[PDB]
Design a binder for this molecule. Structure first.
Ligand SMILES: [Zn+2]
Ligand SMILES: [Zn+2]
Ligand SMILES: [Zn+2]
Ligand SMILES: [Zn+2]
Ligand SMILES: [Zn+2]
Ligand SMILES: [Zn+2]
Ligand SMILES: [Zn+2]
Ligand SMILES: [Zn+2]
Lengths: 250, 247
């Protein structure tokens, strides 16, 4: 509560995908101009940075440092965390669609163009009254959902590959496709895994010890995923080589 | 037609709900052993994965990769699309029934336990020569039909809440809570499914024209809107929870 409160009207963007106050018990209520936003009543503002009103807010609001306005407007790629004083700027990837957020103890503003399937898990939990109760718990639930999705996909590639290891030669272009996807997962998940690890050790006021603990688990989970991606990549290379032998045996 | 034909003998399951061969002009004929199955004349096998022959077939047949075998047996919950090389595995929901299918250019095997009413619109069309003419057209008409049922249900949910609001203007515990519970169940299932439709529209699948993608996009965007309605209804119920509180 070391921070100054915010007026609802100050973050009440009309064309926002979501404009919510967390009720501190797992649910949400509609943001309103007269609400007071503080660390016990955080606001989550979710925007399509393409919609008119959203772009203008993003472009002019005093609540954002000048240097993050562009990022949130889409000008960011690599998974990354940064600190702009009291605030924290985070870019994350899903399986590659991107989620960009600026948040502090009082509020979160996240933006995207293409929908982030991970956020729907959090929105559903909130609608059900079983979501995050504060800003720290929100980021943790988001990073957890992103990791659920990344993990599920990594395992899907693993199974298709295991299948290939037996079932005859593969259809033309397929093995080359799996390899390409693994390499794309690797390129973006390695940095993102470092974002998780940093949030887990960085001393954030609005992140508790439990929060940093949950994150570290999420970071190790993802770490184990990159490990599996790497073994899979090696297998796709071995498979291509041995496929060439099968063909030469004509 | 980059794939080689299937015997039709290799795809006969006596207890099959129905096994059809499409005529590539909007109609079907019942499948037969000598029949030739290919991209021009695809086959639709519709299974109740409970029945003995169907289950044994799903388990044994070499037409299906092994890693999709368990799913078609009911071992899948969330809507999902997975590319298994030549084939694609799709899990889909209707309002909550599940439909599961593996398909390529030549054939479709779909499975369910409880009936998926949506399919009745695809089957009727076929029974009348106005159905799909190839595998890509089938997948589109099927998603279209499911989105239709979902959409009608969403609309019906909204109207129920309006009826509630009209009564409150002329002024039943749990009624609101049930509605809310229904809306969230809907939201839970429909978010992922919209993602599936979105994939089929972005994915480069041989047996889908650009038109099929065009139509898949329309269906995805339409399910997107449906989720907006659901969220609007959800927020509506929370307000009403108070409008009653004051009483
Ligand atoms: Zn503070
Ligand atoms: Zn995701
Ligand atoms: Zn999920
Ligand atoms: Zn592997
Ligand atoms: Zn072909
Ligand atoms: Zn033919
Ligand atoms: Zn119908
Ligand atoms: Zn409504």
């Amino acid at each position: 509560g070391h921070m100054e409160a915010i007026k609802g009207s100050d973050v009440n963007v009309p064309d926002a995908v979501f404009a919510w106050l967390l009720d501190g018990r797992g649910g949400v209520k509609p943001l309103e101009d007269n609400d007071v936003i503080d660390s016990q009543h955080p606001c989550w503002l979710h925007l399509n940075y393409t919609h008119p009103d959203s772009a203008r807010w993003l472009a002019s609001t005093p609540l954002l440092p000048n240097n993050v306005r562009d990022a949130l407007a889409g000008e960011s790629s690599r998974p990354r965390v940064s600190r702009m004083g009291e605030g924290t700027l985070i870019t994350l990837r899903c399986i590659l669609v991107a989620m960009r957020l600026y948040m502090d103890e009082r509020f979160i503003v996240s933006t995207r163009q293409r929908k982030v399937l991970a956020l729907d898990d959090v929105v559903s939990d909130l609608q059900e009254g079983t979501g995050p109760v504060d800003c720290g718990g929100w980021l943790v639930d988001v990073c957890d959902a992103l990791t659920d999705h990344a993990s599920e996909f990594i395992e899907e590639l693993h199974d298709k590959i295991i299948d290939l290891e037996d079932n005859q030669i593969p259809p033309r272009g397929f093995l080359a496709l799996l390899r390409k996807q693994l390499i794309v997962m690797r390129r973006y998940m390695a940095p993102q895994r470092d974002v998780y690890a940093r949030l887990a050790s960085e001393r954030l006021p609005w992140m508790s010890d439990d929060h940093r603990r949950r994150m570290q688990d999420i970071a190790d989970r993802l770490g184990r995923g990159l490990d599996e991606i790497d073994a899979c990549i090696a297998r796709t290379g071995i498979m291509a080589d041995e496929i060439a032998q099968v063909m030469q045996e004509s």
